[PDB]
Design a protein around this ligand. Structure first.
Ligand code: NI
Ligand code: NI
Lengths: 383, 383
């Protein structure tokens, strides 16, 4: 009736990378495709270079794929899957942010099943599972290394459809804090807000449960205390670790109870202006939730306490505001723009972009379903 | 460096059973051994009868094993594994309490690897994993359907050794609240305390982490509010559900940070007097933790708040007591005996049983390592 979908093994803390090399060995895998963006291939902090070697070190082969695109295309999947057909892979290893992992998952399902991303779009339509996937992740925000979602972009009506199948879930997650030093200010603030959005969205979600609620708060608790630190001293590993924790505890929950509107709205803005996922999420949250108050502000009371607001003066509805206050404040501390106008949207675009909220699968888990009116009026509120 | 080990799919709420039949089908399995005790085979509330049929209903075979013994023996494993060699199994399904699941896991590992429970005892010594295991569980306490532990008993020195390998972890967990109506007063109080012990033990544990801490409290939060209910109105499903939640949220955490002494001590008493695991755990907890105070009573402050104690008057050490008070009170509400004397132990046995605490692997995760003296003095305190 209600399922809890998490990866079977998740490694954490420093060494987690090397240790997953060992676990990729002890799992009996030989020749995998590595899926990543440009930056990491080019760079060599943690890079791909330090992994490929660490991968060969515990006795295992390798072949990389550079050309991964932000907003993973149906083309990238075909390019990277065919790319390894020449080496006949058994495991897949994705290094990078969200955009990387979704592709790996794309190649994944299609590498086993009938090669057809949209035939495979919807809920759990696949019969076979993806080839053992190991998600080495470098962002502190998106939960994709654990998540059962791969969203693949496709340039026909420039559609963005969803493969929400369980047999996407990776076999092992790995989060080495050190691969996340790569994140510079701008990006740790972006992903760091994204994760946190992912945490409140399900915490108020229609389909939240004990487990969710639980992981969701501690995630925000960990963000309050450790986010701003990482944004200043990106080098501070201790905050870079607990931020990594947050991102997963957040993942755990948002995977199992979905998101509300903040994501449904911000998904549209992210691929109709190509504005970054995390910032368009941060800039929208306080208004998307200020709306959500009426239905369940009893829960924001927690969101607030988790923010470290002393709410024992306030009643339910009024405390729920102080949470919106602190949410909004936090973003202005990590240097997210305060209004949408800055990101460069336009009021003439609002009626169109809002119709597409009805279409985003994630929207159904909002605690309070809203008329075409009030949701456009949220975009105005966003201004 | 730090791993998080949970099953890949866990179902919950009513229907979870039938739904796992579907998932056993959609996974492409044909002929499994079912592992259970007497009671459930004999009985037919949820029984095995309702499962075997529900299993055949989604197109899959079946063969049961009745003779599972409390404190699973090395003999039971051999009996049930050979039992299905005649039908050549592909999946395994265990229905029942902890004693059931440990056996299923035993058969499991040995059904793939060199048939040698103790050759396979220790940490992660196995190379291959167990045949896909699905743990339908009927107790509200032991986490075994998720846990990476199988402890197999063996009558040579009457040793009780541990197969603490990850490749034990089941492929799917299922918790249908309705299969837990079978639990009568005495047993829901026993397991219900056991789970809760499992929750504090890691919450103070040396190797606790954010995820642990998180799941651990909500587990106790859910126990406070819903345990006593289930013990009175065993028929009350709503409390029987949130109790089922607790038991796993507890599992999640105690699997990843181990336990302290309460378990290390109570394990000995459970197989040197054959007294029930849960009650010998409940009767010991307040004293095992009253000792633990000095090292970290800052955390009991939470345990307490999670108990619903208003602790904002008290300082760290004194609040930590009120938690011991409430822990002790809770057990006397669900009708656990207040002293060990009642269970029928003896002071002459104490020096012997205490030496065996040094041997219990779980003991190493106690926040405060204790001399042979103070731990025997805990048994006295237990009196
Ligand atoms: Ni997101
Ligand atoms: Ni136990």
């Amino acid at each position: 009736a209600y399922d809890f979908l998490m990866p079977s093994v998740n490694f954490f803390g420093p060494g987690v990378i090397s240790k997953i090399g060992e676990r990729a060995k002890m799992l009996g895998m030989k020749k995998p495709v590595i899926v990543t963006d440009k930056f990491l291939e080019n760079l060599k902090n943690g890079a791909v270079a330090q992994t490929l070697a660490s991968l060969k070190k515990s006795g295992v082969d390798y072949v990389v794929y550079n050309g991964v695109e932000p907003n993973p295309k149906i083309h990238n999947i075909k390019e990277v899957k065919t790319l390894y057909e020449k080496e006949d892979a058994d495991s897949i290893i994705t290094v990078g942010g969200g955009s990387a992992h979704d592709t790996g998952k794309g190649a994944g399902i299609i590498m086993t099943n009938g090669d057809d991303i949209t035939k495979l779009a919807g809920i759990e339509t696949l019969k076979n599972p993806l080839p053992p996937l190991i998600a080495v992740n470098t962002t502190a925000g998106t939960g994709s290394e654990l998540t059962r979602h791969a969203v693949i972009t496709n340039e026909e009506t420039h559609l963005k459809f969803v493969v929400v199948s369980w047999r996407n879930i990776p076999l092992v997650s790995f989060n080495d804090p050190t691969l996340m030093l790569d994140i510079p200010k701008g990006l740790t603030a972006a992903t760091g807000m994204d994760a946190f959005v992912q945490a409140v969205e399900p915490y108020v979600s229609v389909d939240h449960n004990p487990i969710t609620d639980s992981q969701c708060i501690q995630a925000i608790k960990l963000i309050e205390s450790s986010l701003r630190e990482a944004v200043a001293n990106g080098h501070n590993l201790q905050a870079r670790t607990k931020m990594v924790e947050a991102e997963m505890l957040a993942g755990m929950a948002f995977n199992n109870a979905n998101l509300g509107y903040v994501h449904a709205m911000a998904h549209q803005l992210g691929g109709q202006y190509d504005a970054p996922h995390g910032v368009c999420c941060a800039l929208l949250l306080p208004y998307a939730e200020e709306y959500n108050l009426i239905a369940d502000p009893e829960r924001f009371a927690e969101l607030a306490r988790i923010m470290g607001e002393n709410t024992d003066g306030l009643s339910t509805r009024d405390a729920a505001e102080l949470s919106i206050k602190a949410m909004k404040q936090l973003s202005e501390d990590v240097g997210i723009p305060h209004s949408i106008k800055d990101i460069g949207a336009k009021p003439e675009d609002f009626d169109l972009m809002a119709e597409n909220a009805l279409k985003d699968g994630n929207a159904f888990s909002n605690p309070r379903k809203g008329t075409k009116e009030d949701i456009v009026k949220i975009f105005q509120e966003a201004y």
